[PDB]
Design a protein around this nucleic acid. Sequence first.
RNA 1: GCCGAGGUAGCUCAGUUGGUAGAGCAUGCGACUGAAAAUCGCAGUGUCGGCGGUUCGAUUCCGCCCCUCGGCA
Length: 315
Amino acid sequence: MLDPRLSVAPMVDRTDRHFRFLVRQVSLGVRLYTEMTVDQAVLRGNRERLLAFRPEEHPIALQLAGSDPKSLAEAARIGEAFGYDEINLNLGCPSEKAQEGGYGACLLLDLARVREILKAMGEAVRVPVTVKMRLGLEGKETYRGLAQSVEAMAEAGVKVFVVHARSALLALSTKANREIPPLRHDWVHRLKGDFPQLTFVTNGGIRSLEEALFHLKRVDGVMLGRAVYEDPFVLEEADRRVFGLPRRPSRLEVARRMRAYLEEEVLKGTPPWAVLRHMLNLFRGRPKGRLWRRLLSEGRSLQALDRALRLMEEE
RNA sequence: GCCGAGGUAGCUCAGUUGGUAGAGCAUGCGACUGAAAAUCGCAGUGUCGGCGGUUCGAUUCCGCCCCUCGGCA
Ligand SMILES: Cc1cc2nc3c(=O)[nH]c(=O)nc-3n(C[C@H](O)[C@H](O)[C@H](O)COP(=O)(O)O)c2cc1C
């Protein structure tokens, strides 16, 4: 039993184990997702570097990308061992890299392939195998086509469908595919109405917790990506209102704990910028936030963070 | 001439071991205590130096070519 009500979207070059730990200091309940991790990188690459994460990041789900059923079943078997509570399948990445590899959003073209992929992964691991998909391809999406492909996946085992509510135009850039196609959140709402036994987590364009709450009164969950990264404290009230916990974090308290987390990591071989480049938005839209962001991007050291914290305390 | 170590936004630069490329300062527009300081948001644009090599595909790895650099000659 997992809590799908709220989560931070998987974002390449964003949601590494460092930023995930940061978000965990802001919200205890919010579900975290790893970056898209290709199956071949899990099978042949340094597995400790890729998948190893901290136990504080629980709950956390490893998202895998691929096309070969046997390769994704082996990659899901490996992810489960590292302790991931969930193995999510990437069916939305419209990059040129994805199209050439035949994985991501272009996998939606072939339900027969996607269904044998899901059957293999689900039987290879005991953790819930989910999916993060898009509404369709080349703006040719129909509601009966999306509901029909969701039916097939559900018969393959899938229970949770994290839906990025917008089509993927393979011709456009990746940054263009997250701003141009129309957001049909109402399509996901109807997916819950046609499939009340399934869990749907709508996603796309959610700017605040107030908007996320609106969508929660219609579907099971909401996923925020750029809203969280651009300013982690967009989930400031997430715990208290969504997860019903009695705790509201302070931007300064979180900075104090992120400093101690930076001391452990740096002191055991972690480059200081690997942790500091994700703390720049901690004071976004706050007094003297500029100087906080300047100090860390210039110094890039524990000592620099100590002087930046001291200033924030003075202010 | 042997070599250290580099070519990424205008700028000083990150990118840790092939997989949805971006930090800072500075340009530009904007919010605000009254113009105004202080303060903050918004967006920006990439042939990741050119040529082949592997690959599903490499800013990332090979060889070649190639501009500023530093000790040795
Ligand atoms: C920088 C960036 C990287 C992303 N990488 C992934 C990814 O690796 N896997 C994935 O399923 N979605 C990825 N996405 C898409 C997000 O998961 C999400 O669907 C999209 O940002 C829209 O949701 P949002 O408006 O709440 O951010 C990425 C988005 C961004 C902005």
